[PDB]
Structure 1
């Protein structure tokens, strides 16, 4: 249960764009600042910038 401090605009299929307050299911956050998150709204995978999300 993470919260995207802001809306992240992805630029490739290896990442998903989120909005501010959007909840994302973090997956792997030990690889790089870009953790893999999965949206539960539609069900799609997409890395995410950690500087744009925070642990509630």
Structure 2
């Protein structure tokens, strides 16, 4: 369960855009600065920038 330090505006069809304070389930975070998160609000998947998120 990570937190999006800020609303992330994705630009590709791989990462999803989140908001500040939004919670996203982290999936794979060992590739680089991009991990695959899963929004629990609707139920979708989309990478996310580690600099806009933090481990809570």
TM-score, normalised relative to structure 1? 0.96
Question: When the two structures are aligned, how many residues end up with a matched partner?
Answer: 56
Secondary structure of the equivalent of 2:14?
A: coil
RMSD: 0.5
Secondary structure of the equivalent of 1:20?
A: coil
Instruction: Tell me how far apart the structure 2 counterparts of residues 8 and 28 of structure 1 sit (CA, whole Å).
Output: 18
Offset from partner CA, 1:3-48 (integer Å, 9 cap, x none): 0000000011100000000000000000111000000111111000
In structure 2, the residue matched to 1:26 is 26
